[PDB]
């Protein structure tokens, strides 16, 4: 199905951010995904302090990866996000646009 990955990455310099994004998208494709688009929401202060990989973070870069993957890939992808040191927090959800906008009256 269609999924959206919300990725909060470490506050890094542009080459490192690009390398991390490339590694993540390559992992997605390796797990059988067709990546549709990549969108940058910007770098911002985290709503609260997040501890990851024995480091404390107060700022981060927010990215969205829209893609199509088999249902079995998602779990696999989650595990990969658990291991990458540059990812403060990675969450895969069903793409918001797939849910039908039933029109109340």
């Amino acid at each position: 199905p269609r999924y959206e990955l919300a990725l909060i990455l470490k506050a890094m310099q542009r080459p490192e951010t690009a390398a991390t994004l490339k590694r993540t998208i390559e992992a997605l494709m390796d797990r059988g995904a067709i990546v549709r688009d990549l969108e940058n929401l910007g770098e911002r202060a985290l709503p609260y302090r997040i501890s990851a990989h024995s480091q404390q973070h107060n700022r981060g870069g927010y990215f969205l990866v829209d893609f199509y993957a088999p249902t079995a890939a998602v779990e696999s992808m989650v595990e990969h996000l658990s291991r990458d040191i540059d990812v403060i927090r990675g969450n895969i959800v069903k793409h918001p646009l797939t849910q039908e906008l039933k029109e109340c009256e």
């Binding site: 199905p1 059988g32 067709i34 199509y68 993957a69 088999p70 249902t71």
Partner: protein, 161 residues
């Protein structure tokens, strides 16, 4: 056996020009990138085409039996993995009993379709027991002895004659 993952979704098989699209579009519109329910729908239509006379009629008893059979297979597949799911064990057992009732009705109403369903879905219809009584230890032992005594007496009678 499950449909190959390359099979197109049921809603994207009769659309014109579906053979003239890119390989990526074919992947996007295949069973590989859908939930299990689409694969179950493909199984269901395959069974309908292979068994029923009119594959479009879904209100018939045989169509309902096919649908319940596909659902029973899905529950069994679910329960191979979730051995401690009691609600789905209940659903599987209820579905099997309901399918038995539907098969009884089909047998009583249309025997040819009953045979075709039993062959197509590999269902082995079974008749209900006549008496519902507890087989306690004493009865079981006594019955075993009676069978043995009958066997020995038959051997004695055959030899003596």
């Amino acid at each position: 056996d499950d449909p190959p993952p390359s099979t197109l979704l049921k809603d994207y098989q009769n659309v014109p020009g579906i053979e003239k699209v890119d390989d990526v579009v074919k992947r996007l519109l295949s069973l590989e990138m859908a939930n299990k329910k689409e694969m179950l729908k493909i199984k269901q239509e395959q069974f309908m085409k292979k068994i029923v006379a009119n594959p479009e009629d879904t209100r018939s008893l045989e169509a309902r039996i096919i649908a319940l059979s596909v659902k029973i297979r899905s529950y069994e597949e679910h329960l191979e993995k979730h051995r401690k799911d009691k609600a789905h064990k209940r659903y599987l057992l209820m579905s099997i009993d309901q399918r038995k009732k539907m098969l009884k009705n089909l047998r009583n109403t249309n025997y040819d379709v009953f045979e075709k369903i039993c062959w197509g879905l590999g269902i082995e219809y079974t008749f209900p027991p006549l008496y519902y009584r507890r087989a306690h230890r004493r009865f079981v032992t006594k019955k075993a002895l009676c069978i043995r005594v009958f066997q020995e007496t038959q051997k004695l009678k055959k030899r003596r004659r």
